[PDB]
């Protein structure tokens, strides 16, 4: 680490008094998904270079930023342009945002991601309600909690065994049912690796071997946090493209290139995060 | 892993001890969590805080500042760590393993591994102790080493063997000494699992360690093994089982009451005995 | 953190202005495999700290010649991340060698055996990697990219040569040899301490046939570059995957018939070096 509390209060007060909207909800927009910034109603953007210890970017295209408003009703604020652990960030920068939010006042994260789909089952558009991941850098000592813990966030060895709120899940999937789509909604794993390079179809055979339904390279740093804090998480992975989990099909790969989320199917998924605003319980 | 201690900084901070007491210890014991107090059972002990030791790394203060403790455990000259140093603190493997470089350079030819430990086989129950027969180094595996960096002929060679890291003699005397005591629970034996943490083991993680063939998961003593062969060193130890980790999404749900615990006092003690009373299995010198 | 463009460029500029060679493939020699650098004819020889902005080895050298017709510049004494070493320091020279002009690289290692089959002697052709670092964070791509080498996300499915491969297979028949050149999955695992029992048991599990601390961090770059890379591993001992045939020990002495079949492996690649396209 290198952020003292006082640090992340600062950021938190200074946001507070610059904007007169107080969310609940946070969202962090995985890539191809910042368009959900757009569904936001009466919105304040603030870019990343202007709010106090945000990590600055040194990433090619705009810094990023941070969008507070309404969704579907909702008291928001959304992240677009996450930091990865590949472009060089210590996850305690990357996860700084969370506990920012939790001293915003926000109780619940929801998480989009883009991934590859390790299961047989999943294609190329469909959606992953987030049931569980494993998290490799963390075995291994990337873990964003390493270090002195603070008992103003949460405790020592906070369990991650229930990281995905049972009630959003067992809510999402009934949600969907009424929405009529033609793929039902997949449920899985999600493997973070921490990239940038790509797997390698021997790779690709162990993560299949490890239960993981799903892989990409965020995401999980930021719900450990979000758990250490105390807020209520649930998530979805766009699954952008099938990996390839042998060498047979591997020769017969033909009119390819490994694109950003159809437009289409990031615009389905930004469309249901909102309306799942409707079930998110109230802070009450 | 970048280590900041010269061979000299090791050799005098032994020196430095070995001219303060007149113990001189064959044995090393690392107490694990909740087993400090097996430190009360030392005769013509002393006492060093890690604060007064030359070189021996250095906290931001929290509640627990541990300790050395040199004396006769049933008869045995031993020195003694209390409170041990995790990764997951933001310790780097160098100064968590630095003291089992130090109990070389003091002539100990033996080390004992304490610690607490998730189940993860089926078979375990909570206040099981495990005789770790082996283990799976998963920090290991990406850079995390303790050896990473030049190698020291003075304490070992470049590429060590950790085949046989867990003494074959002393398993034989543990399982043993255990069943001539009459236990009404056996004597588990298995594989341990390091994880860096601090977070705890979503379901999903608890399946792969599972697969990976380990009985228990912790946090911390590969480190200080790895190192302790490394120099040569008899290495021997226990998993004190305090928690079941779940390992389904069914039972999940269910688990409603309660919380991992501390090892409970007295499974610990129970431990902390049998280490005294394998005090009369090692070798001599 | 560590290289820029411009670094790399420099370095490749110093030595093209400090050589006539020319060299289109790249050889990185593992441990005990350097014997190849004497069959180099003119060759021209660079210590490391004599080359700007290269590490120092802290018994490593570059040298450039020519190899059964085709101008090299081989690598003997490379860099390990169990030496302490970052990977954008070990793989700094992969780089510079794209700079050169390089478009194939070879590379070799000495490996322990997973795959039950394996003898000590075997050759293993290089069909695909996991790169166990890699997954955790020690990826040599990680921080900024430039785009003048390769993409953000590159792709590794193809990462060993299909052509060499099958080109490998052919002279080897053509060799005559008794053994058969075996193919399959190299694990790279950080080191510098070997593995458990219980370790050996995952790798095993993981699907690799041979284990070694090297070589990945520089296939990865390589491919990131568009280098053609093909390579061996050398089984220096069948790792223990077992307690029983931990406790039989033997008339100990793994290193002098790994002689002749460093030799061999030598004598291999020396052969290949026909086989690999023009540009
Ligand atoms: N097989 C794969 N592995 C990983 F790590 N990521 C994959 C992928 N396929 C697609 N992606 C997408 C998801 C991320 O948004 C983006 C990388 O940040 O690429
Ligand atoms: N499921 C679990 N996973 C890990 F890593 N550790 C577990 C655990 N259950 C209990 N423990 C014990 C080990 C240490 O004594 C202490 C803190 O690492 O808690
Ligand atoms: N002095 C030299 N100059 C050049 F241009 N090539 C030399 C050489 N000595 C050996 N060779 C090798 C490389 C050519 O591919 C090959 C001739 O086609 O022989
Ligand atoms: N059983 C084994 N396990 C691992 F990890 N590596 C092994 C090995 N046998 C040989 N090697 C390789 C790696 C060293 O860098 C090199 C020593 O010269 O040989």
Request: aromatic residues 10%; glycine residues 10%.
């Amino acid at each position: 680490n290198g952020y003292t509390y006082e640090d992340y209060k600062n950021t938190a007060e200074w946001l507070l008094s610059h904007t007169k909207h107080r969310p609940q909800v946070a969202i962090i927009c995985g890539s191809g998904l910042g368009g959900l910034t757009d569904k936001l109603t009466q919105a304040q953007i603030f870019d990343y270079g202007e709010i106090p210890n945000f990590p600055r970017s040194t990433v090619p295209g705009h810094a990023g930023r941070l969008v507070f408003g309404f969704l579907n009703g909702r008291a928001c604020v959304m992240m677009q342009g996450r930091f990865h652990m590949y472009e060089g960030y210590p996850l305690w920068k990357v996860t700084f945002p969370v506990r920012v939010f939790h001293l915003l006042g926000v109780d619940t994260l929801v998480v989009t991601n883009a991934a590859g789909g390790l299961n047989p089952k999943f294609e190329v558009g469909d959606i992953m309600l987030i049931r569980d991941h494993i998290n490799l850098p963390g075995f291994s000592g990337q873990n964003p909690l390493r270090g002195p813990n603070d008992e103003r966030f949460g405790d020592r060895f906070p369990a991650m065994s229930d990281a995905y709120d049972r009630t959003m899940r067992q809510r999402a999937l009934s949600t969907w049912k009424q929405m009529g789509e033609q793929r039902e909604l997949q449920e899985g794993t999600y493997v973070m690796v921490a990239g940038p390079s790509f797997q390698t179809v021997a790779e690709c055979r162990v993560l299949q071997k490890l239960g993981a339904d799903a892989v990409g390279m965020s995401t999980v740093p930021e719900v450990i946090v979000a758990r250490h804090c105390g807020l209520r998480v649930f998530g979805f992975s766009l699954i952008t493209d099938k990996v390839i989990m042998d060498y047979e099909s591997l020769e017969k790969a033909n009119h390819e290139e490994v694109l950003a989320a159809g437009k289409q199917a990031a615009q389905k998924l930004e469309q249901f995060v909102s309306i799942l605003m409707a079930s998110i319980p109230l802070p009450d």
